Structures are given as C-alpha cells and as structure tokens.
Amino acid sequence: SGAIYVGNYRVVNRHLATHNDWANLVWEDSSRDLLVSSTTAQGCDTIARCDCQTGVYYCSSRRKHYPVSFSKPSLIFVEASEYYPARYQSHLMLAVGHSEPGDCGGILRCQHGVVGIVSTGGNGLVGFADVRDLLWLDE
Ligand SMILES: NC(=O)[C@H]1CCCN(C(=O)Cc2cccnc2O)C1
Numbered sequence: 654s655g656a657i658y659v660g661n662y663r664v665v666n667r668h669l670a671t672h673n674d675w676a677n678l679v680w681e682d683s684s685r686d687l688l689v690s691s692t693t694a695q696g697c698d699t700i701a702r703c704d705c706q707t708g709v710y711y712c713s714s715r716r717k718h719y720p721v722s723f724s725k726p727s728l729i730f731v732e733a734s735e736y737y738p739a740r741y742q743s744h745l746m747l748a749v750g751h752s753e754p755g756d757c758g759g760i761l762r763c764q765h766g767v768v769g770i771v772s773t774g775g776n777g778l779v780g781f782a783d784v785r786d787l788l789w790l791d792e
C-alpha cells in the first residue's frame with residue numbers, strides 16, 4: 654500500500670483504489686495502473702521533473718529503502734493477475750530488486766523528488782509507475 658499527496662491530489666495504484674478514491678475520481682489510466690483522487694487537505698510531496706535513472710524506493714516487505722538503477726518509462730508486458738489480464742503496461746520503469754504484491758504504493762524518490770510508485774514485481778524485478786510527466790499534478 655501507499656499514496657503520493659501533492660496539492661489537492663492523492664495518487665495511488667489504480668488496482669488498490671478505494672470506494673472513496675472512485676467517489677472523488679479526477680483521473681485514472683488502466684494501462685498505467687494509476688488513479689488520482691481529489692483531497693480536502695493540502696499535500697506537500699514534491700514531484701520530480703527530470704530524466705533521472707537512479708533513486709531510492711521503499712520496500713514494505715523488508716521495512717527497508719533500497720538504492721536502484723531503473724530503466725526509462727516504457728511499454729512493458731505484465732503477466733496476468735486477479736486485477737488485470739495479461740497486457741502491456743505503459744510508463745513503467747524496471748529495476749533489479751525485491752517486490753511482493755503488498756509492496757505496491759511504495760514511493761521511488763530521486764534527488765529531485767517523487768519519481769513514481771511500485772506497481773509490479775516478481776522474478777527479482779521491481780516495476781514503478783512513472784508520475785514525472787503528469788505536470789498537471791502541480792496546479
Ligand atoms: N501493475 C500490475 O498489473 C500489477 C497488479 C498487482 C499484481 N502485480 C504484480 O506484479 C504484483 C506481484 C509481485 C510479485 C509477484 N507476483 C505479483 O503478481 C501486477
């Protein structure tokens with residue numbers, strides 16, 4: 654689990670969005686596994702606006718943060734799960750590292766701020782849903 658709070662927005666994995674997230678829906682993209690809902694309170698997370706390929710992500714299944722090198726956002730095939738059939742997920746970044754289903758929502762950070770959130774895992778790889786291109790999150 655986990656979310657990003659910036660301005661009047663809450664960014665979560667689309668497959669983990671709650672009834673309240675859907676009742677306050679701003680934007681959602683199934684191909685990216687992203688959902689954004691509106692919030693009453695102000696968020697103070699800073700979104701990174703960069704092309705970094707190194708950062709640190711939080712891994713709840715280990716209660717640890719890990720420094721990782723990660724690929725640029727792209728269309729990557731993702732195996733079927735109880736949330737989605739087998740499909741290509743867009744804006745996804747891969748790194749070598751530990752990830753279990755409950756790790757989705759862990760934030761990936763670089764020197765500039767929030768890069769994205771854990772969205773896929775398995776085979777010793779961790780995938781992150783990029784959020785750096787969503788410039789509207791800051792207004
Ligand atoms: N973005 C998605 O489509 C994800 C939806 C939740 C399940 N997904 C995973 O990759 C989680 C996982 C981790 C480790 C081993 N197996 C798993 O299934 C896919």
Ligand SMILES: [Zn+2]
Binds near residue numbers: 701702703705766
């Ligand atoms: Zn950066």
